[PDB]
Amino acid sequence: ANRPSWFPGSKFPAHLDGTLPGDHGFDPLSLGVDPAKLKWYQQAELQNGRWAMLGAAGILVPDLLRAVGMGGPAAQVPWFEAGKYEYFAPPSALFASMMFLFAFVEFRRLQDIRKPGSANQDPIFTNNKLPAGEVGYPGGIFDPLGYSKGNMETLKLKEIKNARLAMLGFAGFVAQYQTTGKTPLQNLSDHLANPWSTTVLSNDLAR
Amino acid sequence: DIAGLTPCSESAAYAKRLKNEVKGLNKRLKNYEADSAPAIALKATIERTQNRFANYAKAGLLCGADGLPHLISDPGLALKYGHAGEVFIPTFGFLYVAGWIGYVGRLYLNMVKGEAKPTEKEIIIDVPAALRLTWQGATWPVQVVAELRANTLTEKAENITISPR
Amino acid sequence: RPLWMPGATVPAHLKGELAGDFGFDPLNLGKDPQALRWYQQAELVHGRTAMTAVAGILIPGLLTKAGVLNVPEWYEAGKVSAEQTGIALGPLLAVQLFMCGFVEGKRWMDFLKPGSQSEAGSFLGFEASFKGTDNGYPGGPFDPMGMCNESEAKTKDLKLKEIKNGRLAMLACLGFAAQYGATGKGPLDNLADHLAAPLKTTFVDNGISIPIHL
Amino acid sequence: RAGNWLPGSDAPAWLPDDLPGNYGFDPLGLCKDPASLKRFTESEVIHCRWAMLGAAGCLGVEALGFGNWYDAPLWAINGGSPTWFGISVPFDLNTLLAVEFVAMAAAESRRGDETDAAKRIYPGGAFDPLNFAKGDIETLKLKEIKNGRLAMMACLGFVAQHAATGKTPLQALGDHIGNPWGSNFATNGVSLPF
Numbered sequence: 001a002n003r004p005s006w007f008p009g010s011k012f013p014a015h016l017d018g019t020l021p022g023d024h025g026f027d028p029l030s031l032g033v034d035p036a037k038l039k040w041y042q043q044a045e046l047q048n049g050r051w052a053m054l055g056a057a058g059i060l061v062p063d064l065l066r067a068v069g070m071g072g073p074a075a076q077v078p079w080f081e082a083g084k085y086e087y088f089a090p091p092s093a094l095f096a097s098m099m100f101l102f103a104f105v106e107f108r109r110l111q112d113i114r115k116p117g118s119a120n121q122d123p124i125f126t127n128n129k130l131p132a133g134e135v136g137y138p139g140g141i142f143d144p145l146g147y148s149k150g151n152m153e154t155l156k157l158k159e160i161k162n163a164r165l166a167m168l169g170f171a172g173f174v175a176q177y178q179t180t181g182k183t184p185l186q187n188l189s190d191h192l193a194n195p196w197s198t199t200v201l202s203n204d205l206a207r
Numbered sequence: 208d209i210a211g212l213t214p215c216s217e218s219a220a221y222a223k224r225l226k227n228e229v230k231g232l233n234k235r236l237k238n239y240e241a242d243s244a245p246a247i248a249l250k251a252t253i254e255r256t257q258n259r260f261a262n263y264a265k266a267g268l269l270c271g272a273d274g275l276p277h278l279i280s281d282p283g284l285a286l287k288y289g290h291a292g293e294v295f296i297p298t299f300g301f302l303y304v305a306g307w308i309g310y311v312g313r314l315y316l317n318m319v320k321g322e323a324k325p326t327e328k329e330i331i332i333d334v335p336a337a338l339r340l341t342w343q344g345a346t347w348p349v350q351v352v353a354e355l356r357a358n359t360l361t362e363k364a365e366n367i368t369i370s371p372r
Numbered sequence: 373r374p375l376w377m378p379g380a381t382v383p384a385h386l387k388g389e390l391a392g393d394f395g396f397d398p399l400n401l402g403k404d405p406q407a408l409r410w411y412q413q414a415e416l417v418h419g420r421t422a423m424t425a426v427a428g429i430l431i432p433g434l435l436t437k438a439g440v441l442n443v444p445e446w447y448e449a450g451k452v453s454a455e456q457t458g459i460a461l462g463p464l465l466a467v468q469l470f471m472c473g474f475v476e477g478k479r480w481m482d483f484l485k486p487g488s489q490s491e492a493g494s495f496l497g498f499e500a501s502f503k504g505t506d507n508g509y510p511g512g513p514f515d516p517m518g519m520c521n522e523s524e525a526k527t528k529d530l531k532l533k534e535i536k537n538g539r540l541a542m543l544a545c546l547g548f549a550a551q552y553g554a555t556g557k558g559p560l561d562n563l564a565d566h567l568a569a570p571l572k573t574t575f576v577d578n579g580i581s582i583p584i585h586l
Numbered sequence: 587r588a589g590n591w592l593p594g595s596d597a598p599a600w601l602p603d604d605l606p607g608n609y610g611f612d613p614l615g616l617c618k619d620p621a622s623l624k625r626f627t628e629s630e631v632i633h634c635r636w637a638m639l640g641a642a643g644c645l646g647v648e649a650l651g652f653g654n655w656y657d658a659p660l661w662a663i664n665g666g667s668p669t670w671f672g673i674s675v676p677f678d679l680n681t682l683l684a685v686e687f688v689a690m691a692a693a694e695s696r697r698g699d700e701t702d703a704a705k706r707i708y709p710g711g712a713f714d715p716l717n718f719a720k721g722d723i724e725t726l727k728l729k730e731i732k733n734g735r736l737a738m739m740a741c742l743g744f745v746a747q748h749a750a751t752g753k754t755p756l757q758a759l760g761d762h763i764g765n766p767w768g769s770n771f772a773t774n775g776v777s778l779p780f
C-alpha cells in the first residue's frame with residue numbers, strides 16, 4: 001500500500017520511508033542509512049544524473065547526426081575520439097577555462113547545500129535574486145519556462161527516473177566501448193542484426 | 208685489510224686447509240667399498256666441508272696467516288667494511304631473546320606474587336599462564352621503556368631490605 | 373562493537389573511545405594510559421606517513437604503467453632523483469633532519485604539555501594556531517577546510533576512515549618492501565603476475581619466503 | 587566591512603568590523619589573539635606598501651624601457667655597472683649592501699620603536715606632507731590595502747610568469763593579448779601537471 005518497490009514483494013528499507021523523490025526503497029548496501037549522508041547522497045544523485053543526461057545526449061546525438069550524415073566532420077568524430085579532434089585552443093586551455101567557470105557555479109551551489117537559501121542573490125545586481133527553492137532545485141531563472149508550478153512532484157519523479165536511466169546509459173556506453181571498442185549506435189546496430197548471438201556473453205566468449 | 212687479516216678468498220693457507228682436510232677424508236673413503244654406508248657418509252662430510260670452506264670466504268671472513276677466519280668487533284670497522292654479520296648483528300639478536308626471556312620471567316613472577324600461595328606456583332609451574340605470557344615478551348623493549356618512563360620497572364629504596372652496614 | 377576477531381576477549385583499557393578500537397591489545401601493550409596516549413599519536417603519525425607514501429609509490433607507478441608519467445620504481449627513484457637533482461645524500465638528509473626535527477620538537481612538547489605551543493609570544497604571530505585539539509589531531513592550521521567541525525559524528529566517521537586506511541597503508545608499505553625483497557619487481561608487476569596465474573604465483577612459490585631445503 | 591569573502595558565510599567574528607580591509611577572510615583563524623591581530627594588521631599594510639612600490643618598479647623600468655626587474659640584479663654577478671634611469675652610478679655589490687643595511691636598520695628600527703601601534707600602521711605627520719588624511723581617511727585606507735593586496739598578488743604573478751614563461755611581464759601580457767587561447771598559464775608547461 002506504499003511507493004513502488006525496486007523488487008515487488010520485498011520490504012522497504014527503514015531509512016527509505018518515501019520522503020525522497022523516487023524513493024522506491026533501494027539501498028541493499030545500506031549506503032544512505034545515515035540521514036545526514038542520505039542528504040548529501042541525494043544531491044549527488046541529482047547532480048551526477050543531470051550531468052549524465054547531458055553526457056548521454058552529448059554522445060548519442062553527435063553519433064545520430066553522423067549516422068544520418070547531417071552532422072559535420074565534427075559529428076563524424078566518435079565521442080571517444082573528440083578529445084584528439086582539433087577546435088581552436090589546445091585541450092589544456094579548454095579544461096583550465098572550464099575549471100575557473102566551474103569553480104564559481106560549484107561554490108555558489110555548495111553555499112546552498114551548506115547553508116540552505118544563502119546563495120540566491122545576484123552578487124553584481126542586488127535586485128536580481130532566485131526565489132526560495134529546495135536544495136538541488138534552484139528554480140527562478142533556473143526555471144525560465146516556469147514549469148515549477150505545473151505538477152512539480154511528478155515532473156521531479158520524471159527527472160530522477162530519466163537521470164537514473166541516463167546514468168546507467170553512460171555506464172553502458174563506456175563498458176561497450178571498453179569491450180567492443182565501437183560507438184553506441186554501432187553496438188546497437190550489431191545487436192539488431194543478429195540479436196541472438198551478439199549478446200555480451202557471446203562477444204566476451206569470442207574475445 | 209683491517210689488521211693485516213687477508214680475506215679467506217685470497218688466503219692461500221685457507222685454500223691449503225681445504226686441500227689437506229678433504230685429502231684426509233678422501234683417504235678414509237678409499238678403505239671402504241663405493242656403496243657402503245661408511246662411504247656414503249664420508250662423501251657427505253667431504254661435500255659439507257667443501258660447502259662450508261666456501262660459504263665462509265663468500266661471507267668475506269678475513270683470516271690471518273693461520274688461514275682461520277677472524278671476526279671484527281668494532282661497530283665502525285664491522286659496519287664501514289661490511290663485516291656486520293659477525294659479532295655486530297649477532298649481538299642484538301641475543302640481546303632481544305635475552306631480554307625476552309627475562310621480561311617474560313618477571314611478568315610471571317609478578318603475577319604469581321599475590322596469587323594465593325606464590326611459593327607453590329614456582330615448583331608446580333602454572334603451564335597455562337606461563338604459556339599466556341611467553342608471547343607477551345615479543346614487544347618487551349616497548350613495554351620495558353614504558354615502565355622506565357613511568358617508574359614501575361624498579362622498586363623504591365625504602366621497600367628493599369638491606370644488610371646492616 | 374566490531375572486534376579484530378569475533379569472540380576475542382576485549383582487554384579492559386581499550387573501551388570503545390579511540391578511532392578503530394576493535395579491542396586488539398593481545399600483548400597488553402597499551403595497558404598504561406600514558407603509553408596508550410603516546411601509542412595513539414604514534415599510530416596516527418605512522419598511518420598518515422604511510423598513506424602519503426604508498427600514494428607516492430602506487431599512484432605515480434599506475435600512471436607510469438599507463439604512459440601518463442615516467443616516475444622510476446620506488447626502489448630506484450632515490451638514485452634517479454639524486455643524479456637528477458645533483459644534491460649529495462649527506463646535505464639533502466641533514467637539511468631534512470633539521471626541518472623534521474623542529475616540527476617534531478613542537479609536536480613532542482605539545483604532547484608533554486598539551487596545548488603548550490600556543491604560549492603567548494612564542495612563534496611570532498601564529499602561536500595560537502599551535503594549540504591542538506585532542507591527541508593526534510592538531511585542528512586549526514591543519515584541517516583548514518574545517519571538515520572535522522561539521523558534527524560530532526562526522527568527526528567520528530572521518531577519524532575511523534583515517535585509522536582503517538592508515539593501518540591498511542602501513543601494512544601495504546611492509547608488503548611493497550617484502551614483495552620487492554622476494555619477487556625483485558614493482559608492486560603492480562607482482563599483482564599483474566599473480567592475476568596471470570593466481571594459483572601458481574604466491575609467496576610460497578617465490579624461493580625466499582620459505583627456504584624449503586627438505 | 588568591505589564585503590564578504592564567501593557571500594552567505596559569517597564564521598569571522600574576532601575580526602573587528604572597523605578594521606580597514608575587513609572582508610571577513612580568516613580560514614585558519616590566525617587573528618583571534620588581539621596581539622597577533624595588531625601584528626598581522628601592521629605586517630599586512632607594510633607588505634602591501636612594499637609590494638606596491640616593487641610592482642611599480644618592476645613594470646615601470648620596462649615601461650620606460652631600461653630593462654626588466656629580473657635583469658636589474660645581475661651586473662654585480664658579471665662585475666658590470668649600475669645604471670639608474672640610464673645614468674650610471676659608481677657603486678658595487680658590497681658597498682650597496684652596506685649602505686642599504688644601515689639605511690634600512692635606522693629607518694625600520696624607528697618605525698618599530700613606535701609604541702602607539704596605530705602610528706606603526708599609519709604615522710602621518712612628516713609621512714603625510716600633502717595631508718590628504720584630512721577626511722575620507724577611513725575609506726582611503728581601504729583603497730591603500732585593496733591596491734596593496736592586489737600589488738602583492740601581482741608581484742607573485744611577475745615571479746611566476748618569469749619562473750614558467752620566462753619572458754618579461756609586459757612581454758607575457760602582449761603574448762596573451764596577441765594569442766589569448768594559445769598562450770596562457772595552461773600552456774606554460776609548468777602550471778599544469780609535469
Ligand code: CLA
Pocket residue numbers: 281282283284287
Ligand atoms: C665498545 C668500545 C669501543 C672501542 C674500544 C672502540 C674503538 C675504536 N673505534 Mg668504535 N664504536 C663503538 C665502540 C668502541 N669503539 C660503538 C658502540 C659504536 C657505535 C656508535 C662505534 C662506532 C665506531 C665508528 C663509526 C668508528 C669507530 C672507530 C673506532 C676506532 C678508531 C676510532 C676512535 O678513535 O675511537 C672510537 C670511536 C668510536 C667509539 C665512535 C666514533 C667514531 C670514530 C671516532 C670515527 C673515526 C673514523 C676514523 C676512520 C677512525 C680512525 C682510526 C685509525 C685506525 C685510522 C677504534 C679502534 C672508527 C673505525 O676505525 O672504523 C673505521 C670509526 O669510523 N667506532
Ligand code: CLA
Pocket residue numbers: 308309310311312313315332337
Ligand atoms: C625470570 C628469571 C630470571 C631473570 C629475569 C633474571 C635476571 C637477572 N639475573 Mg638471574 N638467576 C635466575 C633467574 C633469572 N635471573 C635463576 C633461576 C638463577 C639460579 C641459577 C639465577 C642466578 C643468577 C646469578 C648468580 C646472578 C643473576 C644475575 C641476574 C641479573 C644480571 C642480568 C643477567 O645477565 O642475567 C643473569 C642470569 C643468570 C646468571 C642465570 C639465570 C638464567 C636463567 C636461565 C634465566 C631464568 C629463566 C626462568 C626459569 C624463566 C621462568 C619462566 C616462567 C614462565 C617459569 C639480571 C637482572 C646476576 C646479578 O645478580 O647481577 C647483579 C648474578 O650474579 N642470576
Ligand SMILES: CC1=C[C@H](O)CC(C)(C)[C@H]1/C=C/C(C)=C/C=C/C(C)=C/C=C/C=C(C)/C=C/C=C(C)/C=C/C1=C(C)C[C@H](O)CC1(C)C
Pocket residue numbers: 026027028029030031032048049051052053054055056057058059078079080082083166167168170171
Ligand atoms: C543506489 C544504490 C544503493 C545500494 O545500497 C548500493 C548500490 C546498488 C551500489 C547503489 C547504486 C549506485 C549506482 C548504480 C550509481 C550509478 C551512478 C552513475 C552511473 C552515474 C553516471 C554518471 C555519468 C556522467 C556524470 C556522464 C558524464 C559525461 C560527460 C560530462 C560528457 C561526456 C562527453 C560527451 C557529451 C561527448 C564528447 O564528444 C566527449 C565527452 C565530453 C567526454
Ligand SMILES: CC1=C[C@H](O)CC(C)(C)[C@H]1/C=C/C(C)=C/C=C/C(C)=C/C=C/C=C(C)/C=C/C=C(C)/C=C/C1=C(C)C[C@H](O)CC1(C)C
Pocket residue numbers: 422423424426427430514515516517518519520537538540541543544545546547548551558559560562563
Ligand atoms: C588534513 C586535510 C585538511 C582539510 O581538512 C581537507 C583535506 C585537504 C582533504 C585534509 C587532507 C587529508 C589527507 C592528506 C588525506 C590522505 C589520505 C591518503 C593518502 C590515504 C592513503 C591510503 C593508502 C592505502 C590505504 C594503501 C593501499 C595499498 C595497498 C592495499 C597495496 C596492496 C599491494 C601489496 C601490499 C603489494 C603487491 O605487490 C601489490 C598490491 C597488491 C597492490
Ligand SMILES: CC1=C[C@H](O)CC(C)(C)[C@H]1/C=C/C(C)=C/C=C/C(C)=C/C=C/C=C(C)/C=C/C=C(C)/C=C/C1=C(C)C[C@H](O)CC1(C)C
Pocket residue numbers: 611612613614615616633634636637638639640641642643644647654655656658659738739741742
Ligand atoms: C588572510 C589569511 C587568513 C588565513 O587564516 C591564513 C592565511 C590564508 C595565511 C591568511 C592569508 C595571508 C596572505 C594572502 C598573505 C600574502 C602575502 C604576500 C603575497 C606578500 C607579498 C609581498 C611582496 C612584496 C612585499 C614585494 C616586494 C618588492 C620589492 C620591495 C622591490 C622589488 C624590485 C623592483 C621595484 C624592481 C627591481 O628591478 C628589482 C626589485 C628591487 C627586486
Ligand SMILES: CC1=C(/C=C/C(C)=C\C=C\C(C)=C/C=C/C=C(C)\C=C\C=C(C)\C=C\C2=C(C)C[C@@H](O)CC2(C)C)C(C)(C)CCC1
Pocket residue numbers: 280281282294295298305306307308309310313347351360
Ligand atoms: C655496541 C655494542 C658494544 C658496546 C658497548 C659500550 C661501548 C658500552 C656498553 C654499555 C652496556 C653494554 C651496558 C650498560 C648498562 C647499564 C644499565 C644501568 C642497564 C641495565 C639493564 C637493566 C637494568 C635491564 C634489565 C632487564 C629487565 C628489567 C627486563 C628484561 O628485559 C630482562 C632484563 C634483565 C634485560 C660492544 C661491546 C662493542 C659489543 C657489540 C654491541
